Design a protein around this ligand. Sequence first.
Ligand SMILES: CC(=O)N[C@@H]1[C@@H](O)[C@H](O[C@@H]2O[C@H](CO[C@]3(C(=O)O)C[C@H](O)[C@@H](NC(C)=O)[C@H]([C@H](O)[C@H](O)CO)O3)[C@H](O)[C@H](O)[C@H]2O)[C@@H](CO)O[C@H]1O
Ligand SMILES: CC(=O)N[C@@H]1[C@@H](O)[C@H](O[C@@H]2O[C@H](CO[C@]3(C(=O)O)C[C@H](O)[C@@H](NC(C)=O)[C@H]([C@H](O)[C@H](O)CO)O3)[C@H](O)[C@H](O)[C@H]2O)[C@@H](CO)O[C@H]1O
Ligand SMILES: CC(=O)N[C@@H]1[C@@H](O)[C@H](O[C@@H]2O[C@H](CO[C@]3(C(=O)O)C[C@H](O)[C@@H](NC(C)=O)[C@H]([C@H](O)[C@H](O)CO)O3)[C@H](O)[C@H](O)[C@H]2O)[C@@H](CO)O[C@H]1O
Ligand SMILES: *[C@@H]1O[C@H](CO)[C@@H](O[C@@H]2O[C@H](CO)[C@@H](O)[C@H](O)[C@H]2NC(C)=O)[C@H](O)[C@H]1NC(C)=O
Ligand SMILES: *[C@@H]1O[C@H](CO)[C@@H](O[C@@H]2O[C@H](CO)[C@@H](O)[C@H](O)[C@H]2NC(C)=O)[C@H](O)[C@H]1NC(C)=O
Ligand SMILES: *[C@@H]1O[C@H](CO)[C@@H](O[C@@H]2O[C@H](CO)[C@@H](O)[C@H](O)[C@H]2NC(C)=O)[C@H](O)[C@H]1NC(C)=O
Ligand SMILES: *[C@@H]1O[C@H](CO)[C@@H](O)[C@H](O)[C@H]1NC(C)=O
Ligand SMILES: *[C@@H]1O[C@H](CO)[C@@H](O)[C@H](O)[C@H]1NC(C)=O
Ligand SMILES: *[C@@H]1O[C@H](CO)[C@@H](O)[C@H](O)[C@H]1NC(C)=O
Ligand SMILES: *[C@@H]1O[C@H](CO)[C@@H](O)[C@H](O)[C@H]1NC(C)=O
Ligand SMILES: *[C@@H]1O[C@H](CO)[C@@H](O)[C@H](O)[C@H]1NC(C)=O
Ligand SMILES: *[C@@H]1O[C@H](CO)[C@@H](O)[C@H](O)[C@H]1NC(C)=O
Ligand SMILES: *[C@@H]1O[C@H](CO)[C@@H](O)[C@H](O)[C@H]1NC(C)=O
Ligand SMILES: *[C@@H]1O[C@H](CO)[C@@H](O)[C@H](O)[C@H]1NC(C)=O
Ligand SMILES: *[C@@H]1O[C@H](CO)[C@@H](O)[C@H](O)[C@H]1NC(C)=O
Ligand SMILES: *[C@H]1O[C@H](CO)[C@@H](O)[C@H](O)[C@H]1NC(C)=O
Ligand SMILES: *[C@H]1O[C@H](CO)[C@@H](O)[C@H](O)[C@H]1NC(C)=O
Ligand SMILES: *[C@H]1O[C@H](CO)[C@@H](O)[C@H](O)[C@H]1NC(C)=O
Lengths: 316, 316, 316, 170, 170, 170
Amino acid sequence: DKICLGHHALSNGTKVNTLTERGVEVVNATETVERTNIPRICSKGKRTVDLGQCGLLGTITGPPQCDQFLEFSADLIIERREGSDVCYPGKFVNEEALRQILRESGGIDKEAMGFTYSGIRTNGTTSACRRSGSSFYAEMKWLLSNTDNAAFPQMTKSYKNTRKSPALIVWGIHHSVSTAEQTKLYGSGNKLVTVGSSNYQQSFVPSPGARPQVNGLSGRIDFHWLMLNPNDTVTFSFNGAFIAPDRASFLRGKSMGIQSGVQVDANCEGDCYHSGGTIISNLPFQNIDSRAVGKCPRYVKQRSLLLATGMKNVPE
Amino acid sequence: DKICLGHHALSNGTKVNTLTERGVEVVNATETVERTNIPRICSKGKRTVDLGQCGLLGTITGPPQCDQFLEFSADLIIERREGSDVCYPGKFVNEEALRQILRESGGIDKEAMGFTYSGIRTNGTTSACRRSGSSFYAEMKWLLSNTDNAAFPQMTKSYKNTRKSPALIVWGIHHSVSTAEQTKLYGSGNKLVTVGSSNYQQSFVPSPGARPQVNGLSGRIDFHWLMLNPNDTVTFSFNGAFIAPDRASFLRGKSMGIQSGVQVDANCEGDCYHSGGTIISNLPFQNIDSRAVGKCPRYVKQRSLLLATGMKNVPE
Amino acid sequence: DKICLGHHALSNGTKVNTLTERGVEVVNATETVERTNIPRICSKGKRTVDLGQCGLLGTITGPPQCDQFLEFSADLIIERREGSDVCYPGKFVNEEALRQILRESGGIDKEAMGFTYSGIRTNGTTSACRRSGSSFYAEMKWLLSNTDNAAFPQMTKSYKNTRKSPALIVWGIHHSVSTAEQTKLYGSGNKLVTVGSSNYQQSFVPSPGARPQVNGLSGRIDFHWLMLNPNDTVTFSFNGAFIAPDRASFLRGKSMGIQSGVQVDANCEGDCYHSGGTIISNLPFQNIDSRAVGKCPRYVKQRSLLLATGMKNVPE
Amino acid sequence: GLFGAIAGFIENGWEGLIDGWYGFRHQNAQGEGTAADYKSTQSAIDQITGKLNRLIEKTNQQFELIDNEFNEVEKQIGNVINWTRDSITEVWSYNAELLVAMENQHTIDLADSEMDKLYERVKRQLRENAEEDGTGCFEIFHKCDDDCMASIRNNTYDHSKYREEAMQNR
Amino acid sequence: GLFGAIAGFIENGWEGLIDGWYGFRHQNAQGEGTAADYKSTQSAIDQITGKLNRLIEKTNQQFELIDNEFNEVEKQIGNVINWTRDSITEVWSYNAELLVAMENQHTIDLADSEMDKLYERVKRQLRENAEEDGTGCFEIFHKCDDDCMASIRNNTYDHSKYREEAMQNR
Amino acid sequence: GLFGAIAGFIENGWEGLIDGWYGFRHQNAQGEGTAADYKSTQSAIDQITGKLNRLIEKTNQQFELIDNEFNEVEKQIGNVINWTRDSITEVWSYNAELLVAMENQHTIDLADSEMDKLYERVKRQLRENAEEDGTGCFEIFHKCDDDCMASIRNNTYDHSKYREEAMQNR
Ligand SMILES: CC(=O)N[C@@H]1[C@@H](O)[C@H](O[C@@H]2O[C@H](CO[C@]3(C(=O)O)C[C@H](O)[C@@H](NC(C)=O)[C@H]([C@H](O)[C@H](O)CO)O3)[C@H](O)[C@H](O)[C@H]2O)[C@@H](CO)O[C@H]1O
Ligand SMILES: CC(=O)N[C@@H]1[C@@H](O)[C@H](O[C@@H]2O[C@H](CO[C@]3(C(=O)O)C[C@H](O)[C@@H](NC(C)=O)[C@H]([C@H](O)[C@H](O)CO)O3)[C@H](O)[C@H](O)[C@H]2O)[C@@H](CO)O[C@H]1O
Ligand SMILES: CC(=O)N[C@@H]1[C@@H](O)[C@H](O[C@@H]2O[C@H](CO[C@]3(C(=O)O)C[C@H](O)[C@@H](NC(C)=O)[C@H]([C@H](O)[C@H](O)CO)O3)[C@H](O)[C@H](O)[C@H]2O)[C@@H](CO)O[C@H]1O
Ligand SMILES: *[C@@H]1O[C@H](CO)[C@@H](O[C@@H]2O[C@H](CO)[C@@H](O)[C@H](O)[C@H]2NC(C)=O)[C@H](O)[C@H]1NC(C)=O
Ligand SMILES: *[C@@H]1O[C@H](CO)[C@@H](O[C@@H]2O[C@H](CO)[C@@H](O)[C@H](O)[C@H]2NC(C)=O)[C@H](O)[C@H]1NC(C)=O
Ligand SMILES: *[C@@H]1O[C@H](CO)[C@@H](O[C@@H]2O[C@H](CO)[C@@H](O)[C@H](O)[C@H]2NC(C)=O)[C@H](O)[C@H]1NC(C)=O
Ligand SMILES: *[C@@H]1O[C@H](CO)[C@@H](O)[C@H](O)[C@H]1NC(C)=O
Ligand SMILES: *[C@@H]1O[C@H](CO)[C@@H](O)[C@H](O)[C@H]1NC(C)=O
Ligand SMILES: *[C@@H]1O[C@H](CO)[C@@H](O)[C@H](O)[C@H]1NC(C)=O
Ligand SMILES: *[C@@H]1O[C@H](CO)[C@@H](O)[C@H](O)[C@H]1NC(C)=O
Ligand SMILES: *[C@@H]1O[C@H](CO)[C@@H](O)[C@H](O)[C@H]1NC(C)=O
Ligand SMILES: *[C@@H]1O[C@H](CO)[C@@H](O)[C@H](O)[C@H]1NC(C)=O
Ligand SMILES: *[C@@H]1O[C@H](CO)[C@@H](O)[C@H](O)[C@H]1NC(C)=O
Ligand SMILES: *[C@@H]1O[C@H](CO)[C@@H](O)[C@H](O)[C@H]1NC(C)=O
Ligand SMILES: *[C@@H]1O[C@H](CO)[C@@H](O)[C@H](O)[C@H]1NC(C)=O
Ligand SMILES: *[C@H]1O[C@H](CO)[C@@H](O)[C@H](O)[C@H]1NC(C)=O
Ligand SMILES: *[C@H]1O[C@H](CO)[C@@H](O)[C@H](O)[C@H]1NC(C)=O
Ligand SMILES: *[C@H]1O[C@H](CO)[C@@H](O)[C@H](O)[C@H]1NC(C)=O
């Protein structure tokens, strides 16, 4: 006598939201927000450099812990909490900008500046930089006065970037523990270091004085830097208190840099990274870490947003 | 003979917009953009501190108008146009960053640094800071040379933060009206103040010279600051021209800071504030002020966006 | 016997995308993303100033190439690659901020500062600034010591902004090629230039030394600036090495500034500009240049996004 | 609307219908009467109020000051801030306009939809005992008193009782 | 589409129909003919052009330079700027893709809708004097000449005149 | 939904229907049987999976670090960065919520739509040889064996063969 139309249904549906309603049950639904973290840095197929105890900026100046990183090459660079940019206590002026440049450099290539010195000492070391006895930053030279209290003569040294890409140049300023010990190392008077490039003009008088003992020492070195363009020249006029560059750094290409405290893993691949690990997912959104970097799902505040993939569930 | 279906209607509808059409009339509609301001700061249930004549940064150094604000506590901090951070003319280096830190500090707790001085004056005052006669910043000390033209000896003073949260440290540099009056106060020669922390390296030589008379005076004080981490130590090597910290500031917790020129009102509650007052609304959007702060509706350029809440109006 | 309903169709439709499907063919479709560039700066109806060889910041100080731009007026300001802010080698401190101020200034009006000098030279020139023989920045004065090695006496000069809008004030610091040639020009000793306004406190000691030869010269001039509010006063205490302002700049109104290497064209109008030209379009999106300025379509990554303007195409 | 009833095959609304959104107006031997349909009125109202509860909420996300109205921040950082804020304003102004427009379209279509569903419900009840006028009216061939109309309004109209009558009256 | 007429119960479109979007093609004793329906064509066109007037506008919101193509700004501020711009690009690229996709869905459904409304209008006119073929055709039992077809196309077809004939022809 | 079939004029779904989404359950002289409709099930599945392929993609847009978890950046720039990131989070959190809600609405309406299209298809096949029950059932007046039901399910039911029988049975 009759024929009837109907549709499928379940006892229990999956609640989802619509424009009109909260928690309408549908036959099937799927998650649009990634919550699953992999607690490893997934680096399968990527030239990876894990800096460990080497600070990124240390790769440019070369304290002992960065000796194996002076000319590295990478698609992916990993900074660690234990990293340190220095041996002899100090810091870089404009540090974070330099980090950003280095994180995406693809690594660095080094080249001799070709500075020759006369009438001064170039062999200056310390117990803070240990390479079987006292040493110094591998890419730098601690310029001193020939003997104690001796005049450090007003010097001029220049370097032309004869390459097709910008050169990264770094120099230090030594701030001694006292006004006396500044005179001992470099002679008395007002020490003035000046630096000039087509993009750049600056000057540096030091400032001796007592800092608290870091690495057992109360002295500091101020590292400074500029990017020297192709065919441009940079000149160093200095009267002392100057840590001279021996080599210059050039950038290899392209990379990504991350910060993390988890292990590297060459068995999984991923393009979205954060300090707790890797987000592997095709979902358009994630609720794991808003500071995730690489190619990521968009970070959203919601734990979950279910997308209906079936009709409304209307049970018996 | 018949039965007819229909729907309700009005003579006049409310115009709204759709994907297809502009100004289609519907039976009923409601506003999604807030335009109603309350011209008071609605602070019901909130620990509120209205700074009035005290500038926020003055709470750290303590000019007379900030005497009742040296250790305040708050959920909501209100800066006023008439506020002033100083008595003796001067300013803070990195001022806005410090304001931002203080706006959300939840207020400040103060603690003695424990500096002891020998062979110098600590009692330095002025007519610009009036507490029944000449005075000085309550949390600072104007360090001078024992007598006129007397040498200010190269000093070392240190302070270790022995607490679980960052300490805020502030010191001033005095720039006198002339090169002479610098020598009168602190003796002749090149005055050098240096400051060193694990996060921090800087130095300060002053600069005497004629500024225009502010508060009747042509001298200036440069206030400077850093955040000293737990267990970290900070050292002050100075040769004169130094306004020493007496107390250190610690941050109590969490607050919100606003700027406004309207009265406080403990009868209304609100979480979205701007200089003209409070936006109380559940609407998702507002067209009152794009710089509104707190928990606010989203600012949009449109005065009005009506949302249909009824069917299309089809009158007789 | 019968009557049939149908709809129109074509052999070939235009593929578009929907929520459900990729490349469904419809009867007609139109582009929502602009790809057509006009390779000219469309300036019909706009007061336009093409700076050519004059750098924007040069309009304030006045090297020879900016002589015809000292008091310009404009709705639209165009900077060119060949532009130069200087004649005598140097740069501005805080340069980009100043550019931004000047790009939307609507041009500048100039006014004499009214400085009078006694016991010094004001006529200082150079071969780098050529106006039929040696010259100097038109809006500045190179202040020197009366004769060689002569003391440059500690001077005070002040200027009150007696107008209803902020005054732009610029001064230079000369850094000579050697410590000797600093003494020759301005006498020996520590040269100190100080500047003080109600918003502002700073100081300047120079730094002689060898820079590389730019324009044939190894000296540099550091240009500095502040915005002096109505009724506020600014004082200049200096001991030498000072390039004094002769005139002050006031901002005329409103403009837009762009950078471009294409020609001006008064036959086409446009409000959206980029270095390659003008985007004329009513489309909501563009894929030409993400740094386009003015009133523009929104930049998007897609080349094309077709919007259906007809029904689905269902051919025979 | 998409379903072609409101501002469609029904000529217009009724200003007398203050009881609810949708209703029946009948004509018979005992005169003329009007009454609201609760069920359809309620489906529309509930769905609309459901839109509202979703939109009329503000987020718990706090934002603080990054610039200063009394003491202007450095120009470079100030311009980046203004540019960023203006960009965000442009995004939300767009979002708000699109949200309201697409909501209004859907509201209007949904209201039109409910009217159509009500219209069809009645047709299915009256199977064979009535015909489509074409203006939103069912011409009833058999005699349907007020009691009979009430049975239609309340889902109790047994078509088989009157079938023989209305069939013959074809 | 959602209404199941276009690419639905109607097999395909007509490439001969250049007059308008929708139309009637009839068959009778006097041969075969075709003509456009103005009213439905116009509802679709107006609603579509209405979408366009809304989208084809640019805002009056001016943006200025915050960086420099000739003289690179400081790296830190430069990277914040680029990150911010890239974030905004990501937002607008998403918005544009979604807007166009949801508009295209609605356009297609709306066109399908208008065809269905036209189909139903004719059914209501022809009440009882015709039947549903199932391909978008009404088989007419009584004799309907070209004059008669024109009355259908123009909303003047009085069903009661031919009712007795077509009823008997059941 | 907007078409009033699912959670509409059909009372509920069938938990026994594991073959597909939509189906026929018949009743006759030979008992009772049930079977899935492939065509409608497939239209819904394809359209839904099409939504998924669009949404389940991530962009190729790379973002880098602009701040530091080990070594805090300067406070002013740090606060601008956080404010900017928080603003973007607010935008995407909104976008995601709206996208999913509007997709879910459309999914549910589309599923309801396909059921309605299937319902109407069968009505057009059975022209005059059946009537609308009103719960999603067609009462068939003539004798329709399992072979006859299969012809309905598979678009081969010739109405004219049984027309005389069912007509008389009116
Ligand atoms: C060699 C001598 O005449 N006196 C020795 C004392 O200096 C020494 O006292 C210790 O000094 C330590 C610092 O020593 C260095 C360092 O950094 O390790 C040694 C470097 O050769 C010297 N380098 C240069 C280029 O001058 C360096 C430098 O002067 C300062 O670091 C700059 O501020 O100092 C350290 O402070 C120890 O804590 C301290 O006891 C004693 C110790 O046995 O031996 C003396 O022979
Ligand atoms: C006491 C003395 O020997 N001479 C007095 C004159 O100095 C005084 O002239 C007035 O000086 C005023 C500035 O005075 C102070 C101040 O700031 O109020 C007084 C402070 O004690 C002094 N503090 C310290 C720590 O040295 C302070 C300081 O030197 C400068 O502010 C730093 O730049 O100066 C003010 O300039 C008046 O305008 C001026 O007339 C006259 C006035 O009666 O009395 C003398 O006894
Ligand atoms: C006039 C004199 O006693 N000696 C002349 C030499 O100085 C000159 O050597 C050339 O010097 C050139 C620099 O000359 C200027 C300049 O900038 O053009 C000349 C300006 O009058 C002088 N201005 C002031 C205000 O002092 C200016 C200034 O000293 C420096 O620029 C500041 O650093 O210098 C240039 O360096 C040439 O390369 C160099 O050969 C010779 C050349 O014929 O003639 C002498 O009579
Ligand atoms: C950033 O925008 C603010 C406004 O949102 C600008 O401040 C306004 O400036 C105008 C004219 O200069 C004044 O009339 C208003 O009083 C100001 N309003 C506020 C709230 O401050 C500010 O100038 C802009 N920043 C920069 C660097 O131009
Ligand atoms: C910010 O992005 C711009 C591009 O939008 C970068 O500038 C480009 O840099 C590439 C390679 O360095 C050059 O080939 C182009 O000529 C540049 N384009 C423009 C418009 O300037 C810029 O390098 C980025 N900023 C930073 C700090 O990396
Ligand atoms: C900007 O936001 C970050 C978090 O996204 C803040 O850093 C966190 O600070 C809290 C409390 O200070 C710590 O418990 C976390 O360890 C920090 N998280 C990270 C990822 O760094 C940071 O303080 C904010 N910036 C400023 C200037 O306040
Ligand atoms: C229905 O209820 C049971 C209770 O245990 C639950 O586990 C199950 O997940 C529910 N079904 C669905 C499809 O969500
Ligand atoms: C339900 O959806 C999930 C996605 O989470 C999918 O894996 C599966 O194919 C679906 N299952 C059924 C029975 O439809
Ligand atoms: C740099 O100068 C040299 C001339 O020695 C030339 O060969 C080279 O092409 C120049 N490169 C650029 C980028 O100007
Ligand atoms: C219709 O017109 C009157 C004219 O005074 C106006 O006041 C009223 O608000 C209108 N009605 C509605 C519902 O908008
Ligand atoms: C119309 O909408 C308003 C919201 O502005 C609401 O307060 C009211 O309940 C509605 N009135 C009617 C008669 O529907
Ligand atoms: C600081 O050092 C003291 C040792 O005196 C220790 O008790 C405390 O836990 C330390 N706190 C931190 C955060 O390292
Ligand atoms: C259909 O095909 C031809 C092949 O030459 C192509 O040129 C034409 O553009 C197509 N038609 C449409 C309307 O896209
Ligand atoms: C098709 O759309 C275009 C927009 O690109 C428009 O210019 C034209 O009027 C339309 N043509 C037809 C035949 O509909
Ligand atoms: C500046 O001061 C003068 C008094 O000489 C006064 O006329 C003028 O109105 C003042 N302007 C402002 C903005 O304070
Ligand atoms: C470093 O070099 C100098 C030569 O200038 C030499 O006298 C000195 O002994 C050297 N120092 C060491 C530790 O070898
Ligand atoms: C401040 O202290 C010194 C003691 O070092 C004292 O001689 C002097 O009188 C004091 N000044 C005042 C105003 O009490
Ligand atoms: C510049 O002015 C001084 C007067 O102070 C004069 O002696 C000198 O000759 C002038 N220089 C030139 C080049 O005219």
